Amino acid sequence: TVADKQARLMPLFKHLTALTREKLPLDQRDERLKGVGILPRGTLFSCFHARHLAEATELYVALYGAKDFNDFIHLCEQARQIVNEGMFVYAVSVAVLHREDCKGITVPPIQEVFPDRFVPAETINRANKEASNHPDQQSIVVEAEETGNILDPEYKLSYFREDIGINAHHWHWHIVYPATWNPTVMGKEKDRKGELFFYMHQQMCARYDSERLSNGLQRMIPFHNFDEPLEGYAPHLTSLVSGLQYASRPEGYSIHDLSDVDVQDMVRWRERILDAINMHYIVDKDNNKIPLDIEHGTDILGDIIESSDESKN
Amino acid sequence: VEYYGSLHNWGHVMMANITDPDHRFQENPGVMSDTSTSLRDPIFYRWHRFIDNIFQEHKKSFHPYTKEELSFPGVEVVGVSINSKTANVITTLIKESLLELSHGINFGTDQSVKVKYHHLDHEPFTYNIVVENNSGAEKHSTVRIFLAPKYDELNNKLEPDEQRRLFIELDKFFYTLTPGKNTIVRNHQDSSVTISKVRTFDQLGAGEGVSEDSTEYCSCGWPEHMLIPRGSHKGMEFELFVMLTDHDEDTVAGLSENAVCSDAVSYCGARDDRYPDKKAMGFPFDRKIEARTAAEFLTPNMGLTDIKIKFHG
């Protein structure tokens, strides 16, 4: 049944890391992946970066392409062994969501799959520690709440920012509307995805602002100027899969170019977008102009801003 | 409006509230905010030169003037002389004046409260231009007179390109020339640039007959005392430029009013009328000048007389 199908997919995703060890003696064996085979397993997967997204898209397509559900499980099984795990979860979730063989197949809860992202390192290693400390079938319970000096008032917001449900939602939303989404390949299109992109994020900000006010704090200010230094934040999250953790950032240093992109380019893209909004039209690749219609305008802008594959340019 | 924005105006606003951009401290804006006050701040010039530069770039794109455009054939300017106490010297001094506060601020018991101030002023003078009309018939000419500084910040260098920025318009008027030699005399008082008189609320309390037009009436026009620069005690040297152009070309035809506010046409224009001169404002100075020296620029219907302006302490 579909629920038996659940019970197989969930242990497919259960403990991702250790299901790596590719264990296929010849690299050529998976010609199916000869186009990709660029981002190693341990590395962190970026939802935002273009190259990462490209790989992810390639993966999904294979999953979509799978002739039947059984075939789907097979390629997935074997692909997981070789690809980076984060990318894998991303690609599979997208496949499960869209591919007709999958109704009533929920995914493994993200929080549950990667508990380390949801809870602090201290309650990750305490719990791991208790497991090792005394072997026993008995259950282990750890209270994540901690005790600490709470120097920054931003801490007050933590109930909102840190909330497990909120983070999970954000993960899922991107899955339903992937930036990489190519309507031609799937054949189906996501209605008003660009606009939805705008709306969902706007709501998150709006909701956030209500928290600050509830707190007695002023509304958040936009990061208009690229030059300004950022406030620091330390996540205290570990990635068990490796030793590594998300790097913390202290405050007070202006913005640095990456090899991939320079800040100046970011500024450009903004002036570009503003102009288009201003003259009420955007330029397509064809160099034709499309009007920012009342009906269409938000959607077109959303695709360009994010930007999705859908971006006109 | 949306694409291009409003650069000039915003400049005034931004400079005006530099002290309290954010508006938190609740302070009034500076002088830049008001048309009445803005000239007093030295910043005004810096900004306006900036904007002027924008116009200049546009002017730069235009081609220069040929002899054809400049010259008025058959007419030759023999010489110009300025008559004052001492010929070719204009004297400038400071004069005391009083302003009556009573209309503006609550007077109470007092009949009048006057504040005494001092301003720059100059002796009256006249111009005598000798022109030879080679043609058989009477011609109509527009006489254009400008003043430009001889000296630079380095040493004496009449580089016409630079001069263009400096040249100030003394006067523009129509004169008819008969064949043969002609002498045209004009008095400084007649100057088209300046306002002959502004009636005080007291004069207005009675009822005079300059005629009855409005906000420009006595108000607009450049002030008379201001007509020439201060100069120095030494007697600074200025180039006096007189040019005659074909009036038939210069004027527009149409049907407008009685003699109305036209004294001050050079800077103000005419009431409910088209600007009376076809030539670009600032002609011949508006376009780039190829020549190294101003003298080289001169055509036969142009002339330069060096005069001195000496201030009296």
Question: Mind telling me how many Å the CA of B136 is from chain A's nearest CA?
Answer: 59
Q: Both tokens of residue B60? A: 């730069």
Distance CA A5, CA A25 (A): 30
Q: Is A1 on the interface with B (CB under 8 A)?
A: no
Chain B residues in contact with A275 (beta carbon < 8 A): 3
Q: Both tokens of residue B289? A: 């000048």
Pair B241, B301: CB distance under 8 Å: no
Residue B145 backbone phi and psi in degrees, to 5: -125, 135
Closest to A236 measured CA to CA, from A139, A125, A78, A89: A125
Q: Is A274 on the interface with B (CB under 8 A)?
A: no
Strands B180-187 and B236-246: unpaired
C-alpha dist (Å) from residue B170 to A200, B127, B241, B289, B293: 65, 11, 9, 21, 21
Interface A-B: count of C-beta contacts within 8 A: 5
| B277 CB burial (10 A radius; 0-12, 13-18, 19+) | buried
Residue B9 backbone phi and psi in degrees, to 5: -65, -40
DSSP H helices in B120-183: 160-166
Strands B75-83 and B89-100: unpaired
Distance CA B204, CA B100 (A): 14
Question: Mind telling me how many Å the CA of B187 is from chain A's nearest CA?
Answer: 53
Q: Chain A window 152-181: which residues touch B at a Cβ cutoff of 8 Å? A: none
Which of B3, B6, B22 is best to mutate for the A interface (most A CBs within 10 A)? B3
Q: Is A275 on the interface with B (CB under 8 A)?
A: yes
Q: Is A278 on the interface with B (CB under 8 A)?
A: yes
Experimental technique for the deposited model: cryo-EM
Asked if A275 lies within 8 A of B2 by C-beta distance, the reply is no
| Cβ neighbours of B80 (radius 10 Å) | 21
| B1, closest residue in chain A (CA to CA) | A278
Strands A289-291 and A281-283: antiparallel
Q: Helices A297-306 and A193-215 sit at what angle, rounded to 10 degrees? A: 80
Distance CA B194, CA B169 (A): 10
Structure resolution, Å: 6.8
Pair B115, B99: CB distance under 8 Å: yes
| Cβ neighbours of A113 (radius 10 Å) | 18
Pair B220, B162: CB distance under 8 Å: no
DSSP H helices in A114-192: 115-118, 121-133, 158-161, 164-176, 183-186
Question: Mind telling me how many Å the CA of A281 is from chain B's nearest CA?
Answer: 11
Asked if A275 lies within 8 A of B3 by C-beta distance, the reply is yes
Chain A residues in contact with B2 (beta carbon < 8 A): 278-279
End-to-end CA distance of chain B: 50
Distance CA A255, CA A263 (A): 7
To the nearest 10°, report the CA torsion of A15, A21, A26, A27.
70
Question: Mind telling me how many Å the CA of B3 is from chain A's nearest CA?
Answer: 5
DSSP states of A177-201: S-TT--HHHHS---TTHHHHHHHHH
Question: Mind telling me how many Å the CA of A275 is from chain B's nearest CA?
Answer: 7
The contacts of residue A111 (CB under 8 Å, 6+ apart) are A117, A118, A164, A167, A168
Chain B residues in contact with A279 (beta carbon < 8 A): 2-3
Question: Mind telling me how many Å the CA of B1 is from chain A's nearest CA?
Answer: 9
Which of A224, A277, A278 is best to mutate for the B interface (most B CBs within 10 A)? A278
To the nearest 10°, report the CA torsion of A177, A182, A183, A184.
-170
Distance CA A124, CA A237 (A): 9
| B5, closest residue in chain A (CA to CA) | A278
Q: Both tokens of residue B27? A: 């302070």
Q: Both tokens of residue B173? A: 């008027």
Reduce the DSSP state of residue B286 to 3 states and report it: coil
Q: Using the CB atoms, write b or e for A221-252: b if 16+ within 10 Å.
A: eeeeeeeeeeeeeeeebbbbbeeebbeeeeee
Q: Is A218 on the interface with B (CB under 8 A)?
A: no
| A277, closest residue in chain B (CA to CA) | B3
Q: How long, in residues, is chain A?
A: 313
C-alpha dist (Å) from residue A239 to A118, A119, A177: 11, 11, 26
Chain B residues in contact with A274 (beta carbon < 8 A): none
Distance CA B252, CA B279 (A): 10
From start to end of chain B, where are the E strands? 75-83, 89-100, 114-122, 126-133, 139-149, 168-177, 180-187, 194-195, 222-223, 236-246, 302-311
Q: Which residue has the tokens 């007649």?
A: B190
- Tell me if B48 is assigned to a ligand binding site: yes
| B4, closest residue in chain A (CA to CA) | A278
Reduce the DSSP state of residue B3 to 3 states and report it: coil
| B3, closest residue in chain A (CA to CA) | A278
Chain B residues in contact with A278 (beta carbon < 8 A): 2-3
| A53 CB burial (10 A radius; 0-12, 13-18, 19+) | buried
Residue B311 backbone phi and psi in degrees, to 5: -90, 150
Interface of B with A (CB under 8 A): 2-3
Distance CA A94, CA A98 (A): 6
Chain A residues in contact with B3 (beta carbon < 8 A): 275, 278-279
| A11 CB burial (10 A radius; 0-12, 13-18, 19+) | exposed
DSSP states of A12-66: HHTTGGGG-----S-GGG-GGGTT---S-SSSPP-SS-HHHHHHHHHHHHHHHH-
- Tell me if A172 is assigned to a ligand binding site: no
C-alpha dist (Å) from residue A218 to A153, A166, A209, A221, B162: 12, 22, 8, 9, 54
List the catalytic residues of A: 306
